[PDB]
């Protein structure tokens, strides 16, 4: 027996890190892609005669920042999972916790996008809110 | 000089298979987990004094069926991607198509869950719709 396992585990660690990095890119796309189309949909269908555009653009910049910080937390959670499997490559309490922590960051990204979507429609004049709701139904169903 | 490439490609194959396996698990969880909690949340917070329970249970059974069929399409799309890279391990038209097909199945799963969620609240008495909306805000934000 030698430091052979102490380098095989390091490989397992590095390998899971890369796997996670890619999955993480898919996670960030599975949330941003629908939000981007929904944003273009808002500009094309809903007006701004009381200049809600002023308010909305700030709200979006605030969201992109929160999005960036959850994204960072997800890279760190994946990193702690990569490092924990590099210590003990099995379902230990260390991995159990590190996995749930990845699931949480991924969920908190999807939840934050979802709250932003309703936060955006909140900052709209009732006349426009009805038009925003009517275009949501028309696009999701068809 | 040897079947070295015929085992390097097999590594590429196995590696993409693991990537896909994880992505797939994330996809099935990113949709089911919120829906399950949202369903329990409906039963605990919203009543049924006009027996909407009768209607809703049928709507859910119809959804679980559509969910099962999109889920099957996603396993088949991942399978055709696994088999195509096993033929030519590069960005060929075969892979180009098979990848877009995986993306579509994943999106169609998330979209179907989302439409179901609004389809469920549609079949509710206005008195209950307001209670269902008030509990959604309280749970997502906090
Ligand atoms: C070890 N354990 C089985 C009790 C908990 C680990 O979580 P899970 O594998 O049941 O999701
Ligand atoms: C747009 N497209 C995916 C159909 C073709 C573009 O080619 P490629 O950039 O995927 O190689
Ligand atoms: Zn937005
Ligand atoms: Zn107007
Ligand atoms: Zn101004
Ligand atoms: Zn904008
Ligand atoms: Zn979970
Ligand atoms: Zn439901
Ligand atoms: Zn309950
Ligand atoms: Zn009632
Ligand atoms: Zn039920
Ligand atoms: Zn895409």
Curated annotation (Swiss-Prot), chains A, B:
The keyword Heme does not apply. The keyword Glycosyltransferase does not apply. It comes from the Bacteria. Transmembrane segments: none annotated. To A.eutrophus CnrR. Component of the NCC cation-efflux system that confers resistance to nickel, cobalt and cadmium. May be involved in the regulation of NCC. This is Nickel-cobalt-cadmium resistance protein NccX. It comes from Alcaligenes xylosoxydans xylosoxydans (Achromobacter xylosoxidans).
């Amino acid at each position: 027996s030698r430091t052979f396992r102490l380098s095989v585990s390091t490989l397992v660690g590095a390998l899971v890190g890369v796997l996670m990095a890619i999955v993480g890119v898919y996670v960030t796309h599975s949330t941003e892609e629908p939000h981007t189309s929904l944003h273009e949909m808002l500009h094309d269908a809903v007006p701004l005669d009381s200049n809600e555009r002023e308010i909305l653009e700030l709200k979006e910049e605030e969201f992109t920042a929160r999005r960036r910080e959850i994204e960072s937390r997800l890279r760190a959670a994946n990193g702690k999972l990569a490092e924990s499997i590099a210590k003990n490559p099995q379902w230990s309490p260390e991995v159990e916790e590190a996995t749930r922590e990845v699931e949480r960051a991924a969920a908190d990204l999807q939840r934050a996008t979802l709250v932003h979507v309703f936060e955006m429609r909140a900052g709209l004049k009732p006349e426009h809110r009805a038009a925003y709701d009517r275009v949501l139904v028309d696009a999701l169903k068809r």
